[PDB]
Amino acid sequence: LEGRTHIFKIHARSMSVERDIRFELLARLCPNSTGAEIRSVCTEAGMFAIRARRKIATEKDFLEAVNKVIKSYAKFSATPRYMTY
């Protein structure tokens, strides 16, 4: 959890996120995830904001990004195999 929160912070350092971040909530919401998953979550939050034509990415955008990158793409994940490997 701490590592995922730190990775979220690292990847959202330079973003245009809004006031309240709750990256700890994001980290607990996306467990057993990789830094690649986390960077994709941050990127998808940014793209949701861009698609909405906003200049600020919000917690709702980040939750949508988590739903897209962690849940919807859960079937393409490599961790379930490469953790055994």
């Binding site: 057993n32 859960a74 379930p80 055994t84």
Partner: protein
């Protein structure tokens, strides 16, 4: 005596095979279910019924008892198995206790069966989701949704199948006491929810309804067409 662990945890704590069962569900025709004041409506997408196919033998809506009905979404064979087992259990309940089953009771039984199959040896999960709509002896509409993993919840409006997400968001919006005051209005809501995903209405739609403790009644295609026509009238009036 196969005795093989079919469903097991993945390294990240997921039951991938019940997840695959849920995918089998999501690739099934949409089934919408709503409950109103004194009526529970249950529509389903006919999903390309051929001119040569007897529509009686396609039964995505089945009555488990006089006060409980079940809309299906998934693999039809598992549909039949679960429906038959639920009917047997409902008759057994009528035996043991001299009361008709409760929708909650039957939903709990279906969920228990699904869990047994998800963690029994040599048995793959029931790749189906079910919408149990009915009335209890006290005369209260009830709607439950059961997933392949044995999780069952009580809802005000579901849509399970291909257009599950879109229909669920549509129902989340424009679903209110004013919209469910009357039986006709509830049927309108269900038909609009179905139309939101089924490209052509009327043909690709099958409605069943249950009034308060009277019976299950399947709306005929002419009635469905009439409802769709007046829905179109209301839409064009708005626009």
């Amino acid at each position: 005596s196969y005795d093989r662990a079919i469903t097991v945890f993945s390294p990240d704590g997921h039951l991938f095979q019940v997840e695959y069962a849920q995918e089998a569900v999501k690739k099934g025709s949409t089934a919408v279910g709503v409950r109103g004041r004194d009526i529970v409506v249950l529509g389903v997408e006919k999903k390309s019924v051929a001119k040569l196919q007897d529509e009686r033998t396609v039964r995505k809506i089945c009555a488990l008892d006089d006060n409980v009905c079940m809309a299906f979404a998934g693999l039809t064979a598992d549909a039949r198995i679960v429906i038959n087992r639920a009917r047997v259990e409902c008759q057994s309940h009528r035996l043991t206790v001299e009361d008709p089953v409760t929708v909650e009771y039957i939903t709990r039984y279906i969920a228990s069966l699904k869990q047994r199959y998800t963690q029994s040896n040599g048995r793959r999960p029931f790749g189906i989701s079910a919408l149990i709509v009915g009335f209890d002896f006290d005369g209260t509409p009830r709607l439950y949704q059961t997933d392949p993993s044995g999780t069952y919840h009580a809802w005000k409006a579901n849509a399970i199948g291909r257009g599950a997400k879109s229909v669920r968001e549509f129902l989340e919006k424009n679903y209110t006491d004013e919209a469910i005051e009357t039986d006709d209005l509830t049927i309108k809501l269900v038909i609009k929810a179905l139309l939101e995903v089924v490209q052509s209405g009327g043909k690709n739609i099958e409605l069943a309804v249950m009034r308060r403790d009277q019976s299950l009644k399947i709306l005929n295609p002419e009635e469905i067409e009439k409802y769709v026509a007046e829905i179109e009238k209301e839409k064009e009036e708005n626009e």
